[PDB]
């Protein structure tokens, strides 16, 4: 069937910048191409059809061009709310295939994360486990490293982290890292700390607490 390949797979651009996304069809599809925008947790929205027609009500900054095998979607002036995955699709030839999508993120001024730590609740302890949570709030860029240390020993394989989708209003991210141990293991140690490294921090930041005191 016809394959639709997009490039780049992801990109970061500043507010006000002109952004160009490409989509290559494995064979001539004349002008039977559409573009869609999909924001986190929302359903896709039609932006362009017939390769160059902006759909009714779509912001003017969105436009499409091309015909044959090379198509392009252009955002004339990127806005904070434009963080999303953009997909092209060819719709004349069954099975009406979509491209893999291009992730667009907004490049903003560097912002260091505020770091907060939460000891396990006494409630969870009586459940047999202890989850320690470290929160990195409202930062940019997305890249950040969180390292857990129990009595100064670096942890591995016992933590998981989650990052929020880029904020559509101030383009920042937040991240949660959860260290989980059984109650038995948790009570065999004293100092629990998360060390955070990020571009906005001149030096790593460490937040910690003593089990016996929390």
């Amino acid at each position: 069937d016809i394959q639709m390949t997009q490039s780049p797979s992801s990109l970061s651009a500043s507010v006000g910048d002109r952004v160009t996304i490409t989509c290559k069809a494995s064979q001539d599809v004349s002008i039977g191409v559409a573009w869609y925008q999909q924001k986190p947790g929302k359903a896709p929205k039609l932006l362009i059809y017939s390769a160059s027609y902006r759909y009714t009500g779509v912001p003017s900054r969105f436009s499409g061009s091309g015909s044959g095998t090379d198509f392009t979607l252009t955002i004339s002036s990127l806005q904070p709310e434009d963080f999303a995955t953009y997909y092209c699709q060819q719709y004349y030839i069954y099975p009406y295939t979509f491209g893999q999508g291009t992730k667009v993120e907004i490049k903003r001024t560097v912002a260091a994360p505020s770091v907060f730590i939460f000891p396990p609740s006494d409630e969870q302890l009586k459940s047999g486990t202890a989850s320690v949570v470290c929160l990195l709030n409202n930062f940019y860029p997305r890249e950040a490293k969180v390292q857990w240390k129990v009595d100064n020993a670096l942890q591995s394989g016992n933590s998981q982290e989650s990052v929020t989708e880029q904020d559509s209003k101030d383009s920042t991210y937040s991240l949660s890292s959860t260290l989980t141990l059984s109650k038995a293991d948790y009570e065999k140690h004293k100092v629990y700390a998360c060390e955070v490294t990020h571009q906005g921090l001149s030096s790593p930041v460490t937040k910690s607490f003593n089990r016996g005191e929390c």
Binding site: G32, A34, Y36, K42, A43, P44, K45, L46, Y49, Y55, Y87, Q89, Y91, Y92, Y94, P95, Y96, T97, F98, G99, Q100, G101, S114, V115, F116, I117, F118, P119, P120, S121, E123, Q124, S127, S131, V133, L135, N137, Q160, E161, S162, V163, T164, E165, S174, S176, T178, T180, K207, F209, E213, C214
Partner: protein, 222 residues
């Protein structure tokens, strides 16, 4: 206004069955054709099928023939996707979408409904407080929250103070633990001067297990 509301998604075992519904409104339902497009977790989009509400004729995507059946009730403006012999690979968010032109591009999509194909049992979450303390206070800002742990399947909804508190809230994407159960945290930052003066309750709702929990999060010494 134009709206497409899907429903019927949920957890089903491999080889199980499910029926998704799409209630249309705000336009002459019979003047267009309707489709279903799906998206597996963290993947792209895949067209599923199209149906003409005037003739009932439908076109399916190759690999879905035999287990997916499209139908429509031109008396309620509703579309249906009957699914049988479900495979693990069928786990995805299924979107209902309107097809205006003769071509196959869709101008309006519903919010979608999640279908999870797994043999794992439904389990309600434990809800633990992420207590605010000096350890979660940075000047005029303090953080607090709730840890929603060990539930299945997705999703869970979390609100603060019955939706009264929305600013400063961050409900993180769930993570799948090794146990096969999901876990997520919801946090909120508030001015430090409001801690001892305001009550903070996280309202957790896990529809799949028909469980609803409220948890008051109080400051702690640490």
């Amino acid at each position: 206004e134009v709206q497409l509301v899907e429903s019927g998604g949920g957890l089903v075992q491999p080889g199980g069955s499910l029926r998704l519904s799409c209630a249309a409104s705000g336009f002459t339902f019979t003047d267009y054709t309707m489709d279903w497009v799906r998206q597996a977790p963290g993947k792209g989009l895949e067209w599923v099928a199209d149906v003409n509400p005037n003739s009932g004729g439908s076109i399916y995507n190759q690999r879905f023939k035999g287990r997916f059946t499209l139908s429509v009730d031109r008396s309620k403006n509703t579309l249906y996707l009957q699914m049988n012999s479900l495979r693990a690979e069928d786990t995805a968010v299924y979107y209902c979408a309107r097809n205006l032109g003769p071509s196959f591009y869709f101008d309006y999509w519903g919010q979608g409904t999640l279908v999870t194909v797994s043999s794992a049992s439904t389990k309600g979450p434990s809800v633990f407080p992420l207590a605010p303390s000096s350890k979660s206070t940075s000047g005029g800002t303090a953080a607090l929250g709730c840890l929603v742990k060990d539930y299945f399947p997705e999703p869970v909804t979390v609100s603060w103070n019955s939706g009264a508190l929305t600013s400063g809230v961050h409900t993180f994407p769930a993570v799948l633990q090794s146990s096969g159960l999901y876990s997520l945290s919801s946090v909120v930052t508030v001015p430090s001067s409001s801690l001892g003066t305001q009550t903070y309750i996280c309202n957790v709702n896990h529809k799949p297990s028909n469980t609803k929990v409220d948890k008051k999060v109080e400051p702690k010494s640490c």
